[PDB]
Design an enzyme around this catalytic site. Structure first.
Site, PDB file in Angstrom:
ATOM      1  N   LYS A 176       0.825  -1.210   0.000  1.00  0.00           N
ATOM      2  CA  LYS A 176       0.000   0.000   0.000  1.00  0.00           C
ATOM      3  C   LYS A 176       0.863   1.266   0.000  1.00  0.00           C
ATOM      4  O   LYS A 176       1.852   1.321   0.772  1.00  0.00           O
ATOM      5  CB  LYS A 176      -0.825  -0.039   1.308  1.00  0.00           C
ATOM      6  CG  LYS A 176      -1.518   1.263   1.706  1.00  0.00           C
ATOM      7  CD  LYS A 176      -2.598   1.562   0.734  1.00  0.00           C
ATOM      8  CE  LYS A 176      -3.154   3.014   0.962  1.00  0.00           C
ATOM      9  NZ  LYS A 176      -4.211   3.253  -0.168  1.00  0.00           N
ATOM     10  N   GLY A 208      -7.730   8.044   0.406  1.00  0.00           N
ATOM     11  CA  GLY A 208      -6.983   9.145   1.017  1.00  0.00           C
ATOM     12  C   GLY A 208      -5.805   8.633   1.801  1.00  0.00           C
ATOM     13  O   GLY A 208      -5.231   7.697   1.405  1.00  0.00           O
ATOM     14  N   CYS A 233      -1.855   9.891  -6.929  1.00  0.00           N
ATOM     15  CA  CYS A 233      -3.033   9.784  -6.051  1.00  0.00           C
ATOM     16  C   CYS A 233      -4.025  10.913  -6.313  1.00  0.00           C
ATOM     17  O   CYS A 233      -3.641  12.070  -6.225  1.00  0.00           O
ATOM     18  CB  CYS A 233      -2.542   9.839  -4.598  1.00  0.00           C
ATOM     19  SG  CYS A 233      -3.960   9.664  -3.426  1.00  0.00           S
TER      20      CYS A 233
END
Ligand SMILES: Cc1cc2nc3c(=O)[nH]c(=O)nc-3n(C[C@H](O)[C@H](O)[C@H](O)COP(=O)(O)O)c2cc1C
Ligand SMILES: Cc1cc2nc3c(=O)[nH]c(=O)nc-3n(C[C@H](O)[C@H](O)[C@H](O)COP(=O)(O)O)c2cc1C
Ligand SMILES: *C(/C=C/c1ccco1)=C1C(=O)NC(=O)NC1=O
Ligand SMILES: *C(/C=C/c1ccco1)=C1C(=O)NC(=O)NC1=O
Ligand SMILES: C[As](C)(=O)[O-]
Ligand SMILES: C[As](C)(=O)[O-]
Lengths: 313, 313
Positions: free
Chosen positions: A44, A71, A131
């Site tokens: 991750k 997030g 992201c």
């Protein structure tokens, strides 16, 4: 038939891996991905410090794919680094570690500490420049000067081969500029195309409501929605970066979808939404389905068709 | 229950219209759109001079949507002006005319000529800043300074209310910047969100080939692929441009999809891929399905729910 990749001075059983963020947050997750039949795994995306992420609900899936505004959430870099240095069983498969600091300085800090573990163990860095779910902190690779600064600073601090998780682009001039920025950096050895298609919005008709809580319902899209976009980005960077590898990510549910990514240029093929929905069993299905399509067509190796998508006349 | 709208000093029987480029190139097409149950129609984007467009195949459709690289094809501005001036029956429904010059100067040349016909007949301009299929001419509204130049020059030359066809954006910073540009121009009275999702790539697994001929198979995506992207853009501009109207376009196949667009903030709802695939009979179906949803919810007019999407907490 079997498969054999030798990429990035590692050996892989097959081209499949998770997509960063899916089934790879906790030690339990990482052990599950290691025990699966995937060819590799990625952790991750992490920040220097631990974080909780955005408020729930932050992920929802549907027949055509998923929307998410996860997030921040991760156990922090110290945990993923420890996993890489002390816990991962490299005899089982290669490991990639994804980082996503909130500033160039944060990324630099992390890579200086990752370097010795990369040297000792062979963990591979995936630098996330895409992201779409941090408020105030838009996709770095949509700002080409910012992208350049991050890659310069990381390449100088890190000193070792790494890769980059790219956002999707939609404009030929942007493909050209983005690829040219990447090609300034010899230590960027792979490019992962794509992260989620940012800031989509799913609305439920019955409730008249958005389906995720953060950012007024806006979130990144994955799954069936995004396959043609993913394929375009894989092929665009495969054509423009002849001295790098391209990893495909986006819209893979079947061996046929994987076949299309490989035809477009993909070396490894990452699975996000479909893995989140089906679980790690998906990897034996995808390999069986890919081998069946190769057998029907007479292909014995991935190299025989990687990047060999045909154009018309 | 009522689908009526009164906006831009025109009355519309319902919010449905074709998307520019679909069923609107020839006089035959425009007559067929006029004869349909649509509330309005828009003409094919035109250049000053007639064009042939790109080599065939340039459009393909699939269960999840479509890909296209149509590129230039249109009968030229003179033809669409003539249609607006002399042929269109304004007693049936309002007409929008779409323009897409290859330079600011070409756009300016057209709008100078359109203006007297707009004034006399009430034809409405839709300025296309988002075509993803011209090599060497990327989407104008991806270059915010170019966007501003075009809007300033067209505003000065035209001097009348108009609207803009926008590309999809994927980044909150881009929504903020794009809307702020648009809000510098009071004559921009409507924003149509969205044009095709640019530069996707569809590959056929059996043939191992791209499915459209131009641009090595790359083309803009429509249909089911793009509905969450379209809803995001509609809502993003609805929220950021409180003094303008937003027209929704992207992914509409049903009255439910139109309901979602309207909850997101749409005034008019445009139909591209689904109308290309089903034909103009789609408009009676869309009307019946939207009225069915309204009846179930107790809604009597569109303004009772337009823009009223709910967020969580
Ligand atoms: C729940 C979830 C979390 C994700 N978190 C990350 C992340 O930490 N890092 C990252 O690079 N991408 C992240 N992504 C994006 C995925 O890696 C992948 O790029 C995207 O989902 C598209 O692939 P798909 O169509 O297979 O889902 C996340 C996706 C999902 C669905
Ligand atoms: C065959 C075809 C031609 C198009 N030509 C134009 C055009 O001339 N002008 C324009 O603004 N958009 C054009 N578009 C884009 C559509 O207006 C619309 O924005 C897009 O198809 C997304 O809507 P959809 O999901 O309903 O297809 C075209 C789309 C298609 C499929
Ligand atoms: C954001 C990356 C988040 C993260 C949090 C700690 C370190 O990075 C995501 C991403 O890259 N792609 C996604 O689809 N979802 C995300 O939240
Ligand atoms: C391009 C615009 C074409 C045009 C032809 C004459 C003037 O402009 C397109 C567009 O806007 N959207 C699409 O999906 N397809 C196109 O080719
Ligand atoms: C992504 As998890 C740790 O909730 O499988
Ligand atoms: C129970 As199942 C849908 O994991 O075969």
């Amino acid at each position: 038939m079997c498969l054999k990749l030798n990429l990035l001075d590692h050996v892989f059983a097959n081209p499949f891996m998770n997509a960063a963020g899916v089934l790879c947050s906790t030690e339990e997750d990482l052990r599950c991905m290691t025990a699966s039949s995937s060819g590799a795994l990625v952790s991750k995306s992490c920040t220097s410090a631990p974080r909780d992420g955005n408020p729930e609900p932050r992920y929802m899936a549907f027949p055509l794919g998923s929307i998410n505004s996860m997030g921040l959430p991760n156990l922090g870099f110290d945990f993923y680094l420890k996993y890489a240095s002390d816990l991962h069983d490299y005899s089982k498969k290669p490991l990639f570690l994804s980082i996503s600091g909130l500033s160039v300085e944060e990324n630099v800090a992390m890579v200086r500490r990752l370097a010795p573990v990369a040297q000792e163990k062979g963990v591979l860095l995936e630098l996330n420049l895409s992201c779409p779910n941090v408020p105030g902190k838009p996709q770095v690779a949509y700002d080409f000067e910012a992208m350049r600064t991050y890659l310069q600073q990381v390449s100088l601090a890190y000193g070792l081969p790494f890769g980059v998780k790219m956002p999707p682009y939609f404009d030929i001039a942007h493909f050209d500029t983005a690829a040219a920025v990447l090609n300034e950096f010899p230590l960027v050895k792979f490019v992962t195309c794509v992260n989620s298609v940012g800031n989509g919005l799913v609305i439920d008709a019955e409730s008249e409501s958005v389906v995720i809580k953060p950012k007024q319902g806006f979130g990144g899209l994955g799954g069936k929605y995004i396959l043609p976009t993913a394929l375009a980005n894989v092929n665009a960077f495969y054509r423009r970066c002849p001295d790098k590898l391209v990893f495909g990510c986006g819209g893979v549910y079947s061996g046929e979808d994987a076949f299309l990514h490989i035809l477009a240029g993909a070396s490894m093929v990452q699975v996000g939404t479909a893995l989140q929905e089906e679980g790690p069993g998906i990897f034996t299905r995808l390999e069986d389905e890919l081998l069946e399509i190769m057998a029907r067509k007479g292909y014995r190796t991935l190299e025989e068709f990687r990047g060999r998508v045909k154009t018309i006349e």
